[PDB]
Amino acid sequence: NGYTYEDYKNTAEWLLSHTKHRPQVAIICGSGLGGLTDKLTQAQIFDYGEIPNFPRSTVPGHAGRLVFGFLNGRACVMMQGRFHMYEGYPLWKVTFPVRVFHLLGVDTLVVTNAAGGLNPKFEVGDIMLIRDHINLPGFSGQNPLRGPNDERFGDRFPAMSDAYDRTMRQRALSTWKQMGEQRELQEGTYVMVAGPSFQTVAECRVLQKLGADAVGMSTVPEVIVARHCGLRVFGFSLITDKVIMDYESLEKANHEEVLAAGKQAAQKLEQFVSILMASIPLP
Amino acid sequence: GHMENGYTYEDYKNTAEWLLSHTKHRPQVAIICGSGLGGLTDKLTQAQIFDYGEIPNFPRSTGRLVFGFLNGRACVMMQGRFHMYEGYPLWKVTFPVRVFHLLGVDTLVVTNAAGGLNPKFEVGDIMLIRDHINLPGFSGQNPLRGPNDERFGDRFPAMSDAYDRTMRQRALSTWKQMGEQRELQEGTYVMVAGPSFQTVAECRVLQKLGADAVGMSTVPEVIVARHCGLRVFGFSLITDKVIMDYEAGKQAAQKLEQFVSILMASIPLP
Amino acid sequence: MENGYTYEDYKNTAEWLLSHTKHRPQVAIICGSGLGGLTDKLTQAQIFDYGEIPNFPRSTAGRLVFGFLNGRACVMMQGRFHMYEGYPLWKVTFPVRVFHLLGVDTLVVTNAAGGLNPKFEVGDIMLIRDHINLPGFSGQNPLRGPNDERFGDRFPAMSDAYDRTMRQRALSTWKQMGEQRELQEGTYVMVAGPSFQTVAECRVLQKLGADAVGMSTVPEVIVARHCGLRVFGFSLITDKVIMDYESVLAAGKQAAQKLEQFVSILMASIPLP
Numbered sequence: 017n018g019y020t021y022e023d024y025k026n027t028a029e030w031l032l033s034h035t036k037h038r039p040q041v042a043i044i045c046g047s048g049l050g051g052l053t054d055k056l057t058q059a060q061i062f063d064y065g066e067i068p069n070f071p072r073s074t075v076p077g078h079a080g081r082l083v084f085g086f087l088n089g090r091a092c093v094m095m096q097g098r099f100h101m102y103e104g105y106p107l108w109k110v111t112f113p114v115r116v117f118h119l120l121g122v123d124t125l126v127v128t129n130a131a132g133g134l135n136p137k138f139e140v141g142d143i144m145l146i147r148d149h150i151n152l153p154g155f156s157g158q159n160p161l162r163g164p165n166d167e168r169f170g171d172r173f174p175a176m177s178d179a180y181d182r183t184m185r186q187r188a189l190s191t192w193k194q195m196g197e198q199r200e201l202q203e204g205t206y207v208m209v210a211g212p213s214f215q216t217v218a219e220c221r222v223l224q225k226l227g228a229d230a231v232g233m234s235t236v237p238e239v240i241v242a243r244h245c246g247l248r249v250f251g252f253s254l255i256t257d258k259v260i261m262d263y264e265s266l267e268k269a270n271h272e273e274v275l276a277a278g279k280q281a282a283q284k285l286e287q288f289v290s291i292l293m294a295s296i297p298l299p
Numbered sequence: 300g301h302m303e304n305g306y307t308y309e310d311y312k313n314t315a316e317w318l319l320s321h322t323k324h325r326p327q328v329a330i331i332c333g334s335g336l337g338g339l340t341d342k343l344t345q346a347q348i349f350d351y352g353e354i355p356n357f358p359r360s361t362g363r364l365v366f367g368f369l370n371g372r373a374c375v376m377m378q379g380r381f382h383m384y385e386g387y388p389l390w391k392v393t394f395p396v397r398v399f400h401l402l403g404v405d406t407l408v409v410t411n412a413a414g415g416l417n418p419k420f421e422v423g424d425i426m427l428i429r430d431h432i433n434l435p436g437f438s439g440q441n442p443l444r445g446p447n448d449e450r451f452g453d454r455f456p457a458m459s460d461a462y463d464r465t466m467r468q469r470a471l472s473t474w475k476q477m478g479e480q481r482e483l484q485e486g487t488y489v490m491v492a493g494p495s496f497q498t499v500a501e502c503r504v505l506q507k508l509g510a511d512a513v514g515m516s517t518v519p520e521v522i523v524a525r526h527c528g529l530r531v532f533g534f535s536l537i538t539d540k541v542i543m544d545y546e547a548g549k550q551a552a553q554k555l556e557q558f559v560s561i562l563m564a565s566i567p568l569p
Numbered sequence: 570m571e572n573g574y575t576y577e578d579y580k581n582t583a584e585w586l587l588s589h590t591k592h593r594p595q596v597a598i599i600c601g602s603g604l605g606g607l608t609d610k611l612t613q614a615q616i617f618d619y620g621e622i623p624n625f626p627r628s629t630a631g632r633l634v635f636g637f638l639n640g641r642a643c644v645m646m647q648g649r650f651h652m653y654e655g656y657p658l659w660k661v662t663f664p665v666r667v668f669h670l671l672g673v674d675t676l677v678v679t680n681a682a683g684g685l686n687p688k689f690e691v692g693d694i695m696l697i698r699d700h701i702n703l704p705g706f707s708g709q710n711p712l713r714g715p716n717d718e719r720f721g722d723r724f725p726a727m728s729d730a731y732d733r734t735m736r737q738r739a740l741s742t743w744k745q746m747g748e749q750r751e752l753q754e755g756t757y758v759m760v761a762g763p764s765f766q767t768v769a770e771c772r773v774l775q776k777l778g779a780d781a782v783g784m785s786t787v788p789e790v791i792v793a794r795h796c797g798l799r800v801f802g803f804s805l806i807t808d809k810v811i812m813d814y815e816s817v818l819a820a821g822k823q824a825a826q827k828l829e830q831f832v833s834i835l836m837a838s839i840p841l842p
């Protein structure tokens with residue numbers, strides 16, 4: 017909605033004429049993972065406010081930025097600060113950047129996010145390779161593809177069964193081994209809820225019964241739009257808290273030093289994404 | 300902003316009265332043709348066509364109404380339905396059903412093309428719709444949202460008896476005596492908003508929820524119809540099997556079209 | 570603001586109310602359908618129609634009543650707003666924010682629900698222990714949009730929505746009441762409505778672990794918790810939801826009355842600053 021094809025094109029063209037960079041891979045940084053932009057080399061920064069047609073920031077803190085550069089050698093463009101539905105953005109604004117990435121000539125999207133753990137076996141700071149998703153907003157009509165289809169992007173009714181690239185998953189699992197980590201790289205299903213409130217125990221139990229392994233309030237729309245455009249997609253959730261799944265466990269004690277360990281866990285995810293650039297196929 | 304109804308009662312009545320004075324036909328039955336089943340209109344006798352663009356207040360397509368007799372029965376047939384995924388609000392989607400009621404229709408037949416969730420189902424099957432699951436409805440996308448007009452129905456219409464019991468018995472028995480190679484399957488249709496297809500994980504929740512087939516239509520129309528007091532029955536043509544783990548059609552539509560014709564005889568009189 | 574109210578708006582309303590009433594309420598009660606008879610038990614009552622009150626959404630019935638109930642200063646809302654009537658949730662929950670800025674610290678919610686737990690009988694009272702916010706899952710959450718920290722957190726916890734202390738005291742007051750039916754306890758699921766559930770829909774609500782279903786309340790509770798209001802509430806079971814294909818107005822007036830009297834009794838058991 018709201019944007020014409022020309023808008024997307026005008027934006028891609030503007031970016032293309034104001035940077036010499038030509039990215040192949042786009043990375044969307046989740047909450048706490050913005051430090052990935054510091055890992056880029058020969059970086060060139062664009063504040064959203066400079067970029068024509070880019071949705072204005074409505075939220076506290078600085079407007080986000082698009083950072084171009086190389087990540088372990090690979091030509092990348094990186095979004096720091098994503099738009100969320102819960103902040104009152106429509107989905108067509110949330111996913112505006114993904115369409116622009118396509119027109120930039122990007123062929124791969126990496127998504128990161130911070131998630132609540134639903135699978136009992138997960139621990140705070142685990143990384144979960146996303147194998148699949150459940151789109152709750154989507155079932156009810158909040159789907160970023162709603163409205164007339166543009167065949168210049170893709171098909172009317174795109175398949176999502178193969179959303180998370182199988183080759184990249186095999187290669188993530190295989191690269192993880194060489195890094196010799198304490199814990200295994202987890203694999204499972206991300207469920208999107210609109211938020212912003214956190215789940216009740218009842219709601220946490222439904223989400224488990226539905227087969228979700230991790231929950232958050234982002235990502236899925238970007239992935240749907242990415243696949244519509246024929247982008248290759250892989251992604252990771254950093255598990256930032258275990259979701260409370262019983263009333264007995266409302267005998268709960270908080271330890272505020274869970275935030276130094278979380279900087280370390282974010283850092284591990286940032287460096288794992290970085291290294292995986294070696295394993296993405298070239299165009 | 301969601302479900303901001305632009306239609307007054309007067310608008311619905313103006314449309315019904317325009318159609319009533321531009322054709323002598325007086326339908327008892329309205330039939331909504333799903334994707335690939337528009338050829339049902341060729342079966343009508345004594346037909347008159349109205350393009351949607353010609354009829355007042357009717358939503359514009361991106362479409363026609365055909366009146367006629369189907370196997371002797373006074374019908375109105377909708378060829379080219381509106382879908383939520385195209386960006387139509389549900390009050391535009393179900394506008395035709397309001398109009399049909401004011402035309403005099405007492406029965407709605409809904410047909411659609413669906414994905415198979417029940418593993419028993421095969422491509423080309425016909426599923427008699429026993430019940431539904433309205434996922435959009437749970438969250439707010441219900442075509443009855445807004446002030447209720449008692450001229451149409453109650454504030455809180457019951458939906459447990461949505462798919463007429465008698466018609467389900469007569470469809471099961473009429474099929475039996477057609478002696479078909481395939482059994483007439485029966486189950487729950489789940490509506491999702493669309494337009495993207497299900498992931499393996501979403502296909503599995505839909506199965507867990509007890510749905511046998513999935514699609515992106517029909518349910519709003521059924522709800523509006525029951526609000527109005529219409530008898531309802533319907534069928535899904537199974538066009539694909541939904542992928543549920545991590546690993547021709549023209550003829551089958553024709554079989555449905557012909558089964559719908561035959562079943563006109565089983566519908567009670569007004 | 571577009572699609573909402575600013576802090577200034579809610580404050581303007583609360584200040585207006587506060588300079589047009591003598592009452593300073595501690596407890597707010599939002600009455601469900603058929604349960605508004607409590608308002609006639611308020612002493613030193615003072616009544617405002619919604620159209621009287623700045624920024625208040627106009628019902629399309631509906632009033633606000635301040636007074637004392639069983640020794641406690643209350644504000645009572647008769648004729649709540651529902652999503653199915655076409656109201657956005659930021660209108661539905663507008664009064665809860667006003668109540669907070671009035672100085673209320675406790676919200677009592679009642680509603681009329683369909684029974685999904687097979688054990689529940691028509692006329693039963695269910696103490697709400699938890700909820701499932703179906704519309705919340707998909708976008709319809711009253712906190713959607715810009716957040717003001719004068720009300721609460723960006724990502725508020727709802728694990729503890731239904732106050733544990735009141736829950737125990739309700740159970741305890743019921744035991745001493747001598748009532749013959751047990752006081753039921755379970756999860757309320759909100760559906761947007763207005764159409765009632767199919768058999769298939771009822772069965773998913775059951776599999777999801779919900780004990781009773783209705784079309785209200787959850788939004789008010791979320792906004793209340795976001796505000797730090799203490800919350801407890803009750804569902805009167807008005808019908809058993811048809812759960813299989815097998816397929817009274819005066820008994821429900823008595824059952825409603827019983828709920829009204831239970832809320833009035835419990836005024837005495839709410840903590841007091």
Ligand SMILES: Nc1nc(F)nc2nc[nH]c12
Pocket residue numbers: 130131132133209211213214215231232233256257258259260
């Ligand atoms: N990290 C998280 N934890 C809980 F409990 N609920 C959530 N909903 C979205 N994200 C969440």
Ligand SMILES: Nc1nc(F)nc2nc[nH]c12
Pocket residue numbers: 412413414415491493495496497513514515538539541542
């Ligand atoms: N035929 C279909 N297949 C899948 F997977 N999803 C759908 N959603 C609606 N129709 C559908």
Ligand SMILES: Nc1nc(F)nc2nc[nH]c12
Pocket residue numbers: 681682683684760762764765766782783784807808809810811
């Ligand atoms: N009381 C009720 N009964 C049924 F059947 N469905 C409902 N949906 C909301 N309330 C309901």
